[PDB]
Symmetry: D2
Subunit: 333 residues, 4 copies
C-alpha cells in the first residue's frame, strides 16, 4: 500500500527493494544512486553473490526500472534535497547511503515532498525503533526515524525477553560479524579506523560497535547496563551475537530456552527465532528473522551468569525489518 | 640436551620440530608417522603454507631425515607400543597424533622405551601444565603429562594475572578460532559433532571447548569459576580469546593494562605479551607468545565487569611451549 | 518411474537425491552410507552450506528416511556385496562413494539384486557416457557404466559443438575448480598427490585431470587431440573450463557464439547453456546446466586459434546429469 | 644506495618497493607522497603487513619524517602530483604507484616538482615499457618517463623469451589465475565501467581482461600480434600463476623445454626467471622475488608442437623488486 523511495542502491537499498517485492508489504516507486545508471541497476538487482538471482523479472523500460512489471522512477542526484520524491509519488524514503544519518542531513528528503524518512542505520539524534521491541512507541508526529543497526535488531529482541523474565543486571556482547562493503580486499587506507583497513580475507579484525549501548535507548531499563565489541571475520554474510549477562532472578538454562521458545511462537514470531538444531552460519543465509536463539550453542556457568548465542542474516533480516516498520507506520496513518 | 621423539608429524609435530631446531632447547632424534614416508616428510617439513619455507636444510640421507645436518630415525607404525623409541635414543616423546590423549593410550610409548610422554592436547586424566602458570608443579614422578590446549595456554596466563591482582569471581570465555585439520573443506561426515562436519571455508561454526574449565585445573583457585565455547571461522591460523569476567576487587581498565604490561615485561616475558597497537590476527602469525593482551580491543562496563581480549598463534605459540616444557622437565631430571 | 538406490550419501549422493526429488525423473527408494545413521542423514540432507536448506520435507519415520512423504530404506554396509537392493526395490544403483569405481567393485551391487549400476565418477574400465554427447551409445547390454566427471561433462558438450562446426585439430584445457571433499583445511597428508594435501583455504593448487583426455573417449574423433590440467582455488563451489584450441575451418568469434547459442536452444537445451551476461562464479550456484558458454570472457587470437570459457556448478550440474542418464537408461526398457 | 627515489602512492606496490629498496640497498628512498596516509599512519602501514609479515628493521615518526632503519624520509600529502617538491627532498627518480597517473602526460607532472625521471609501476598507453631480463638493455638516457609493465607481463615475458629463442612461438594464448587486488570489492558493489570487477572478491571466480599478453609483443617485438590472453581473479590475497598455451615452430620435447628453462634460470635470467620440479602451491611463492618461476611438474604437452607452460609469480613482491632493479639499471646509464 504505502509508496516508497530508496536513497542509495547498496546492499541495503537493493535488499529492502527485494524484501518489498518478495513480501508485497510496500510499493517501491523511486530509487536514487548517482554511481549506478539504469542498465547497471538491472544487473545489480538481478544478480547477487550472497542471495542468488532475483526470483521475478527485472528490465529497463522507457528509462524506468521494471521489477515484476511494476515501473520505478530513477534519480542520478548527488544531493538529497534536489531529489523530487514528490513528483514520483513516494510517501516514505529509506535513507540507505549511510552518509545522511542525522535528523538534519536525513531531513533533506522532506524538501522533495517526502512525507516521512527511515534511516537504514543508527542516528546520532533521530528516534530509533526495533520491530518487536519499541515499535508501538511510534506515532504520527515522527517524520524522521531510524531502524537502528542490524546488530541492535539482533540483540534487542533477545535482551527484551531475558530482561522481562530474569532481569539483566549487566551484559557484555561480542558480535562475530561477516565482512562489509567498508572493508578492504588487501591492506589499504581506513584513516580513522586503522584495523578496518587490513585485508578482510586474511584477518580477524576487532572493531567498536554502538549496538549494545543502543539497546539501552530502545529498552530504557537497560540504559548503561550493556556494552560490547565486534570481530570482523572472513565470511560474506551472516553474523552471530554472543551476550554474556548476569541475571537478577535465577534462570536455569532450560527456563531460558522455555521463555525464548514461547516468545518466538507468540508476540515475537518472525522477529525472534528459536532453534535446537546443530546450525552453522550458512543455515541463516536469507533467513528473515532479526535474531535466532541457538539453544545448543549457549552455555551457563550457574543460574545467574550465562552466555546466549543468537544468529542474524545482517543483510536480509534488517532489510525485512525496514519493510515491516514502514508497513506498521502506514497501518497507523 | 634431552633427546625427543615426535609421534604424529602434523601441524604440531612439524612445528615442534621447527621450534626445537630454531631454539636448540631439545634435540629431535626420531619421528613416527605411518601416513608420511621419509621423502614426504622432507617436503611437508620444508614447505609450510602458514609459516613459510624452513630456514635451514632438510634432506633424506641413508633412510634418515636430516635437518640442519642432524639425522633423525623415521618410524612408520600405527601402533604406538611398537615404536622403538629406546633404540633411537628418544627419552621424551611428544604425542601429537590427536588419537592417544588418555594416560592409558599415551602410556603405550613407555613399552617402546620412552621415559616420559608429553601429550600435545588436553587429557581426561594426565596432569596438565601451562608454562608460566603451574609448570613448577611438575616433578620427576610424572611420566605422562599434558601441555593442555592452545586455548588454555592463551587464557591461563591472562587469568593468572587478573586473579593474582583483582580476583576472578566468575568468567565466561569465547574463542574465535582458526580452522584446524579436524574440519572439512565442504559439508561432510563428523558423526559425533555434526556442526564440525560443515564446510570450514563457508561457515562460522560454534563448538564446545574444555579450555576455560581446564584453567581451573592449572589454577586450582579458579576451579568451577570459568567456562566457555568457541566459534571456528575461515582463517588458516591465529585465534583470539574474549574473556568476560566479574572481578572480586574493583579495577579501572588502566589498572588492568598496567598489571598485564608488568607481567609481560617480568615473570611472564615470552609467554604473555602486551600491545596497544591496532593489531589484527595476521600480526600474530609465527608469534611465539602463548597469549598477547590487546589493550585497545578490550572494554569495561564498570570496575567489576570487563571483557579482555588476547591473541594467540594456536600453532606456533603452543609448539614453542611444548619445547619449553620438555626443556624444563629435562632440567629437573 | 525407475526405482534407484544410492551408495554413498555425500555431496553427489545427497545432491543426486535432491535432483531426483526436485525433477521427479526417478524414484529414490534406498540409501547406503555406514558413516551417516538415519538421524544424521536427515540433518545432512536438510541443511546444505552451498545450496541452502532443502525445499520440501525430510524426517526419520519407522526407521526410514522420508523425503516429500516418500519413504526410503536405509542401509549401513561397508561391503557393497551385502546391500539388499533387491528387497528394497532398487533397480539402478548410483555408486557415489568415490571408492568403488571399477567394474569389479561396482559390480558387487548386482549380488544384492540391483540390475544396473551408474558410477558417479570416471572409471578405469566401465564405459563412460555424457548426456548430449554419447548417451545414445548406451544400450541394454551395459549393466555397469560411468557418468564421467563433472569436468568431462562441462568440456564434452562444448567440444562437440566446436568440433562439429569447425573441427578441433588440437586443444589444451585448464579448469579453475572449486575445492572438494578430498582436499584439506590445513597442510596435511595426501598419499601420492602431495600438492592436494596443501591447505585448500590458502592455496592455488595445480592438479592432474583425465577430463580432457576422457573427451576423446565420448567423442572418438578427438581421441589424442585434447589434454589439460586443473587449478584448485578457494571457492566452495562452481568451476570454469578454459579450452584453448586450434580449429581446421575458419571461425570468427561471432560464428562461434552463433553456433553455441543455437546448440543451447535446440538439441543441447538444459545441458549446454549460453550467456552474454557479465557473470561470475556465484551466478552459476545451483545452475543445473553441464556447461554454460561465457561469450564475453573468451578471446580469439585469430580465426583458427581461440580460448573458450564455460562455467559449471560441479556439484549440481553433474548430479542432474546422473538423474537424466538413469531416466534415459529407464526409457530403453 | 646511489639514486635517490621518491614514491608516489604508498600502497601495496609503494610500500613493497620501499621494503625492497631497504632490503637490496640498490636505491635510497628519500621521499614519499600519499594524501590518504599521514605520517603516523605510514609507520603502522609500513611496519605491519598481512601478506609479507612485520618489517624486519625499525620504523618510527620523528620531527615530521618517516625514519626507516635510521634513514629519514620526507613525507608529502598532495593529491596533485605537479605540487610535490621532489627536488627539495633530493628525489631524482619517482615511482608512480598510485594507479591514476599512468600516461606520459599525467606521470610527467613529477618533473614540475624537480624529479629527473619517472617509473610508472603499471602499463602505460604511451610510456615505453620495460621488463628486466627481456628488454631493459633498450632503456637509454633520453627516456625521462617509462613503465615497468604489469606483474603479469613480468611473469610471461621472461618465459616467452626463453621459449621463443629456442623453439619459436607461432602463436600463444595465456590465462592468469590471479590473486585479488585493491581495485576489487569485499561484497557486491559499484564498478560502473567493469561490472564483473564489482562482484564480491571473497565469493567469486571473476573473469577479467588483461593487456599483458599483447604487451609481451611490445617488449619482444618478434612476438608482436602472436599472443593474447585473459585473467581469472580468485579469492587469495597474493600470488598468481600464468598458464601459456603455445604452438611452437620447432619440435620441443617437454624434457628439452625443461632443460633450456633451467639453463636460463641458472645463467642470463638468474633472479628473474626461476625453475622448479618441486610439488609447489601458490603459498610457496609468497615473498619470492622472482618475476616468473617455471613449474616443470604442472605443465603438460599434447605433442612436440603444442604445450601448456605454468609459471608462478608473487604479483606484489617480484614486481616491487623489479621496480628497484630497473631504477638501479637506469642510474647505471646516467
Ligand atoms: N550491509 C550490512 O550488513 C548492513 C546492515 C545494517 C545496516 N547497514 C547500513 O546500511 C547503510 C548502507 O550499507 P550497505 O552495506 O548497503 O553499503 P553499500 O556500500 O553496499 O551501499 C551504499 C550505496 O549507496 C550509494 N551511494 C553513495 N553515495 C550516495 C549518494 N550521495 N546518494 C545516493 N546513493 C549514494 C553507493 O553507490 C552504494 O551503492 C550503512 O549505513 C550501513 O551501516 C548495513
Ligand atoms: N593445530 C592446532 O592449532 C593445535 C594446537 C594445540 C594442540 N593441538 C593438538 O595437537 C594434536 C595434533 O593436532 P594437529 O593440528 O597437528 O593435527 P594434524 O592432523 O595436523 O596432525 C596429526 C598427525 O598425526 C598423524 N597420525 C595419525 N594417526 C597416527 C598414528 N597412529 N601414529 C602416528 N601418527 C599418526 C597424521 O598422519 C598427522 O600427520 C591434536 O591433539 C590437537 O588437538 C592442535
Ligand atoms: N563434488 C563434485 O564436484 C563432484 C562432481 C562430479 C563427480 N564427483 C565424484 O562423485 C564421487 C563422490 O564425490 P563427493 O564430492 O560426493 O564426495 P563426498 O566425500 O562428499 O561423499 C562420499 C560419501 O561416501 C560415503 N561412503 C564412504 N565409504 C562408503 C562405503 N564403503 N559405503 C557407503 N558409503 C560410503 C561417505 O560417508 C560420504 O558421504 C567421487 O567419485 C567424485 O570424484 C564429484
Ligand atoms: N598489487 C599488485 O599486484 C600490483 C602489481 C603490479 C603493479 N601494480 C600496479 O601498481 C599500482 C598500485 O597498485 P597497488 O596494488 O599498490 O594499489 P593500492 O590501492 O594498494 O595503492 C595505491 C595507493 O595510492 C594512493 N593514492 C591514491 N591517489 C593518490 C594521489 N592522488 N597521490 C598519491 N597517492 C595516491 C592510495 O592512497 C594508495 O595508498 C597500480 O597501477 C597497479 O595496477 C599492482
Ligand atoms: Zn576392472
Ligand atoms: Zn521398464
Amino acid at each position: 500500500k504505502v509508496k516508497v523511495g530508496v536513497n542509495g542502491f547498496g546492499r541495503i537499498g537493493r535488499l529492502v527493494t527485494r524484501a518489498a517485492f518478495n513480501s508485497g508489504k510496500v510499493d517501491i516507486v523511486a530509487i536514487n544512486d548517482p554511481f549506478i545508471d539504469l542498465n547497471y541497476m538491472v544487473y545489480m538487482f538481478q544478480y547477487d553473490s550472497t542471495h542468488g538471482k532475483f526470483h521475478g523479472t527485472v528490465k529497463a523500460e522507457n528509462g524506468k526500472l521494471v521489477i515484476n512489471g511494476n515501473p520505478i522512477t530513477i534519480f542520478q542526484e548527488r544531493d538529497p534535497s534536489k531529489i523530487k520524491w514528490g513528483d514520483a509519488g513516494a510517501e516514505y524514503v529509506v535513507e540507505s547511503t549511510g552518509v545522511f544519518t542525522t535528523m538534519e542531513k536525513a531531513g533533506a528528503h522532506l524538501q522533495g515532498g517526502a512525507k516521512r524518512v527511515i534511516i537504514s542505520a543508527p542516528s546520532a539524534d533521530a528516534p530509533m525503533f526495533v520491530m518487536g521491541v519499541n515499535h508501538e512507541k511510534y506515532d504520527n508526529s515522527l517524520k524522521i526515524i531510524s531502524n537502528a543497526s542490524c546488530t541492535t535488531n539482533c540483540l534487542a529482541p533477545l535482551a527484551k525477553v531475558i530482561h522481562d523474565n530474569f532481569g539483566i543486571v549487566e551484559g557484555l556482547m561480542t558480535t562475530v560479524h561477516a565482512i562489509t562493503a567498508t572493508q578492504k580486499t588487501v591492506d589499504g587506507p581506513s584513516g580513522k579506523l586503522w584495523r578496518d583497513g587490513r585485508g578482510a580475507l586474511q584477518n580477524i579484525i576487532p572493531a567498536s560497535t554502538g549496538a549494545a549501548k543502543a539497546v539501552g535507548k530502545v529498552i530504557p531499563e537497560l540504559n548503561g547496563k550493556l556494552t560490547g565489541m565486534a570481530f570482523r571475520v572472513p565470511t560474506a554474510n551472516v553474523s552471530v551475537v554472543d551476550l554474556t549477562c548476569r541475571l537478577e532472578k535465577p534462570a536455569k538454562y532450560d527456563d531460558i530456552k522455555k521463555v525464548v521458545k514461547q516468545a518466538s511462537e507468540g508476540p515475537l514470531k518472525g522477529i525472534l527465532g528459536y532453534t535446537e538444531h546443530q546450525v552453522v552460519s550458512s543455515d541463516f543465509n536469507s533467513d528473515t528473522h532479526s535474531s535466532t536463539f541457538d539453544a545448543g550453542a549457549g552455555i551457563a556457568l550457574n543460574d545467574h551468569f550465562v552466555k546466549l548465542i543468537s544468529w542474524y542474516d545482517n543483510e536480509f533480516g534488517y532489510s525485512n525489518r525496514v519493510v515491516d516498520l514502514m508497513a506498521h507506520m502506514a497501518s497507523k496513518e
